[PDB]
Amino acid sequence: GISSETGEMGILWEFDPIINKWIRLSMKLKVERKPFAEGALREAYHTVSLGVGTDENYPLGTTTKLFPPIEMISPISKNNEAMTQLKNGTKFVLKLYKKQQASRELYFEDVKMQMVCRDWGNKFNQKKPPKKIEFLMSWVVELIDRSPSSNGQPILCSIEPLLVGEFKKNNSNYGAVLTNRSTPQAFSHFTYELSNKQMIVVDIQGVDDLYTDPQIHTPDGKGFGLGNLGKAGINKFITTHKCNAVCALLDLDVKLGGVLSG
Ligand SMILES: Nc1ncnc2c1ncn2[C@@H]1O[C@H](CO)[C@@H](O)[C@H]1O
Ligand SMILES: [Zn+2]
């Protein structure tokens, strides 16, 4: 339930890969004035939840140029991760694009991308590796109380749980290997091999195998946001990848093998 305390309203979107649908909710939140960190394109803000509710007050309207399209939206939203993970009082992180080559579609793609990587994390863990991994939930929020931009586009953001500890990036989306840890690189290799080269998960970053904001490359280069560099991204990973003990333990081929022709 949404608290009566002072904060701003949002439409909250959760993607559920197993039913292949978005779940639409509302929430109230209070976000700090200044960001605590920044990346290339976005800034991160500390936020507290003032509760999660239904989307009943905020009708979608007609389905012509609705994103996501109505057929991708669950009619029912009684069950979801948000109602426990974003319950009243929860401290979490909000990310906003600075200064904006970001369509509406991009916010949803990026969050769906994180949910897909979250599935890959569970698949990896089922092999009983020495260190289990996990990707945080992420959500799209339409900050509906904020006045639209120069164009009548609502203000959009993504939100995710707060990581406590030293945040480290382990690889980039274009071949950088940034720490000496084995598990992040083995996981990237695992995703390439076990997907039959349909995709790779890189930008493996977070605190101690609790990861967030990954990026996927696919051979055809379609979908998965603007950070999908296609075969180029896959090949760049291969040039710098050196199999380690976790790769061996997972019985991964030391020969990675070529990209798919489109
Ligand atoms: N979920 C999160 N929890 C805490 N810090 C984060 C989170 N996501 C991103 N960051 C911070 O923002 C930076 C990204 O530029 C990271 O280096 C990290 O310091
Ligand atoms: Zn390897």
The CATH number for 109's domain is 3.30.200.20
In a 3-state reduction of DSSP, which class is residue 207?
Answer: strand
Amino acid found at 247? C
Domain endpoint, select from 164, 192, 214: 164
Q: Which candidate, 131, 126, 159, 121, places its Cα nearest to that of 44? A: 159
Angle ∠(65,67,68) on CA atoms, nearest 5 = 135
In a 3-state reduction of DSSP, which class is residue 249?
Answer: helix
What is the C-alpha separation between 19 and 135, in angstroms, rounded? Answer: 19
Kindly state the tokens that stand for 227.
């950070």
In a 3-state reduction of DSSP, which class is residue 185?
Answer: helix
Any atom of ligand 1 within 6 Å of the Cβ of 67:
no
In this structure, the strands spanning 37-38 and 155-161 are unpaired
Q: Whose CA is nearest to atom 11 of ligand 1?
A: 37
Strand residue runs (E) in the chain: 8-16, 21-31, 37-38, 42-54, 91-97, 134-135, 139-143, 155-161, 168-169, 200-202, 205-207, 210-212, 215-217
What is the C-alpha separation between 50 and 181, in angstroms, rounded? Answer: 38
Any atom of ligand 1 within 6 Å of the Cβ of 159:
no
Whether residue 104 sits in one domain with residue 17: yes
Number of neighbours of residue 81 by Cβ within 10 angstroms? 14
CATH number at residue 256: 3.20.200.10
Check if the beta carbon of residue 96 is closer than 8 Å to that of residue 43.
yes
Residue span of the structural domain in which 232 resides: 165-262
In a 3-state reduction of DSSP, which class is residue 232?
Answer: helix
Write down the residue that tokens 């948000």 correspond to. 82
Domain endpoint, select from 124, 141, 164: 164
- How many structural domains compose the chain? 2
Question: Distance, CA 125 to ligand 1 centroid (Å)?
Answer: 24
Farthest CA pair distance, the chain: 59
Check if the beta carbon of residue 201 is closer than 8 Å to that of residue 191.
yes
Give this entry's resolution in angstroms. 2.0
What's the gap between Cα 236 and its chain centre? 22
Going by the DSSP 8-state scheme, the letter that residue 12 receives in this structure is E
Check if the beta carbon of residue 237 is closer than 8 Å to that of residue 209.
no
What is the C-alpha separation between 45 and 92, in angstroms, rounded? Answer: 8
User: For ligand 2, a single-atom ion, which residues have Cβ within 5 Å?
Assistant: 189, 243, 247
What is the full DSSP assignment across 100-152? ----HHHHHHHHHHHHHHHHHHHHHHTT--SS--EEPP-EEEEETTSPP-SSS
Q: Across-strand partners of 43?
A: 38, 96
